[PDB]
């Protein structure tokens, strides 16, 4: 839903990096000018749930179905400055700047797990491409207008 | 008398730049001088340029040039706006008076002088 876009936001203004140069994932988008170092938030990793909360509110009476989950979103950096935008990210991920800018992004951020300089077969040529891994954990939610119970009439019986 | 397709190559000519890179390195730091020459050639498309699928889609135009001048692999050819690495399906009828190569657009910007 919004999680991948959120982590894209976080990487947008942790690296102080451009809008148009962060594309999402295995969507359709042309990577022209290989040296223009792109970053893509690959979300192809299976997101697995952890719990299904259910809270209820009394006065402004509605309730709240939540679902905590996590996904191994990878980051692929491209371009001549792929390596740097890998390392400089893979290392600022756990600074002030990151941990201070991911304020409202309803999305935890775990440590970078591993890296790889797996390039891409660009047709008789090799374009710089680096993957970095980190589990991301978030929790989508929805709100539903149910209604409470004010009393309960009932009857008993005995032998 | 070896047949010579050279005269059968002039009509279809086109101006084009042929460059080569002679990498230079000190303490393992990459610099690249360039050698560019205006050479004769003829260009056709080589592999109909498709759109591959990946994390991001990419596409590299293919051209396959002929010329009377010798063309080693580690050389680029610019004809319109983007040089092509002379990588594939090339063949040297040098004794027959010409040679040919496919081409791979290096999505990098064109190597002017560095």
């Amino acid at each position: 839903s919004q999680s991948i876009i959120n982590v894209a936001r976080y990487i947008r203004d942790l690296l102080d990096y451009d809008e148009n140069l962060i594309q999402f994932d295995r969507k359709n988008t042309q990577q022209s000018d290989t040296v223009t170092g792109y970053i893509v938030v690959n979300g192809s990793g299976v997101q697995n749930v952890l719990s299904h909360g259910s809270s209820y509110d009394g006065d402004a009476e509605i309730m709240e179905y939540s679902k905590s989950e996590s996904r191994l979103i990878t980051l692929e950096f491209y371009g001549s400055d792929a390596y740097e935008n890998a390392e400089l990210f893979s290392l600022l991920n756990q600074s002030q700047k990151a941990k201070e800018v991911s304020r409202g992004l309803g999305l935890t951020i775990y440590n970078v797990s591993q890296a790889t300089d797996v390039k891409q077969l660009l047709g008789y040529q090799y374009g710089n491409r680096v993957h970095v891994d980190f589990n991301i954990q978030y929790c989508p939610s929805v709100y539903v207008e149910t209604l409470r119970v004010d009393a309960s009439e009932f009857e008993i019986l005995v032998d | 008398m070896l047949p010579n397709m050279r005269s059968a190559l002039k009509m279809f000519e086109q101006s084009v730049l042929l460059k080569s890179v002679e990498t230079i390195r000190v303490d393992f730091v990459d610099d690249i001088i360039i050698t560019a020459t205006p050479i004769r050639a003829v260009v056709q498309v080589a592999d109909k340029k498709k759109l591959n699928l990946d994390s991001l889609d990419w596409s590299k135009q293919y051209i396959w040039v002929h010329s009377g001048s010798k063309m080693e692999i580690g050389q680029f050819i610019e004809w319109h706006g983007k040089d092509f690495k002379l990588v594939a399906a090339g063949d040297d009828y040098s004794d027959y008076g010409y040679n040919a190569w496919y081409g791979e657009e290096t999505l990098k910007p064109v190597l002017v002088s560095s």
Side-chain angles (χ1 to χ4, degrees):
Chain A
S1 80
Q2 84 280 350
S3 65
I4 292 176
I5 299 105
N6 262 329
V7 61
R9 283 162 200 300
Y10 155 72
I11 191 166
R12 174 280 300 300
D13 67 331
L14 181 59
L15 277 297
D16 294 323
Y17 184 77
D18 297 359
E19 286 12 33
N20 295 7
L21 271 66
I22 295 169
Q23 293 313 60
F24 277 128
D25 201 346
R26 210 178 66 261
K27 302 289 200 300
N28 278 202
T29 300
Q30 188 141 7
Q31 177 210 359
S32 170
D33 203 350
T34 300
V35 304
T36 46
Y38 292 165
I39 301 145
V40 286
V41 285
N42 182 8
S44 56
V46 61
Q47 71 280 45
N48 61 6
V49 308
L50 297 182
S51 297
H52 295 276
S54 285
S55 298
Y56 188 88
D57 196 352
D59 198 76
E61 181 273 305
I62 62 170
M63 66 179 288
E64 188 274 332
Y65 289 110
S66 66
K67 174 188 73 164
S68 170
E69 56 198 353
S70 74
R71 39 187 320 153
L72 179 65
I73 62 170
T74 71
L75 294 177
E76 315 191 1
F77 306 86
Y78 293 61
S80 70
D81 55 353
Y83 277 3
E84 297 299 299
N85 295 268
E87 183 216 343
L88 176 52
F89 162 75
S90 171
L91 187 53
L92 287 170
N93 178 43
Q94 323 164 20
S95 67
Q96 252 324 335
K97 187 149 306 180
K99 273 199 135 154
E100 185 186 312
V101 65
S102 75
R103 251 188 279 237
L105 315 167
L107 187 153
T108 60
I109 298 190
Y110 289 82
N111 276 19
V112 61
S113 171
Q114 67 176 21
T116 303
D117 61 341
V118 64
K119 295 136 191 196
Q120 60 173 350
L121 276 295
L122 283 184
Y124 306 132
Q125 194 159 10
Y126 274 163
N128 282 320
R129 185 198 190 193
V130 293
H131 292 199
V132 289
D133 292 352
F134 66 113
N135 290 327
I136 203 69
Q137 181 265 300
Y138 63 91
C139 58
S141 59
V142 70
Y143 285 64
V144 171
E145 181 164 307
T146 74
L147 72 165
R148 68 154 159 282
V149 285
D150 279 347
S152 60
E153 72 176 293
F154 60 104
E155 77 50 41
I156 66 171
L157 61 84
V158 60
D159 64 17
Chain B
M1 212 47 55
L2 294 173
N4 207 318
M5 211 186 207
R6 186 82 191 282
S7 292
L9 191 70
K10 186 180 289 293
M11 185 66 204
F12 284 89
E13 68 89 19
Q14 175 156 50
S15 64
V16 65
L17 273 297
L18 187 153
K19 327 182 177 74
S20 178
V21 293
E22 305 179 2
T23 183
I24 177 58
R25 263 180 339 168
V26 298
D27 218 335
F28 285 24
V29 179
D30 293 334
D31 299 327
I32 43 168
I33 77 168
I34 301 299
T35 286
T37 49
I39 193 66
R40 251 339 170 191
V42 64
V43 302
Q44 299 180 332
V45 296
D47 291 331
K48 322 268 275 191
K49 177 263 285 187
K50 60 160 169 270
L51 178 144
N52 295 95
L53 277 296
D54 200 333
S55 299
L56 301 86
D57 294 302
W58 61 259
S59 72
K60 270 152 76 159
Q61 189 173 329
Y62 281 71
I63 63 169
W64 65 274
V65 305
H66 311 286
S67 178
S69 174
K70 183 175 174 66
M71 285 181 297
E72 284 291 332
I73 297 167
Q75 305 164 317
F76 303 151
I77 275 173
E78 67 177 0
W79 68 297
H80 284 176
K82 45 204 170 274
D83 60 0
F84 295 91
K85 196 163 185 169
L86 276 296
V87 298
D91 56 355
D92 61 19
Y93 300 135
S94 302
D95 277 355
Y96 296 110
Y98 83 100
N99 61 353
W101 292 94
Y102 275 8
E104 276 312 75
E105 87 177 9
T106 56
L107 306 170
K108 321 201 176 82
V110 67
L111 292 176
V112 290
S113 66
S114 191

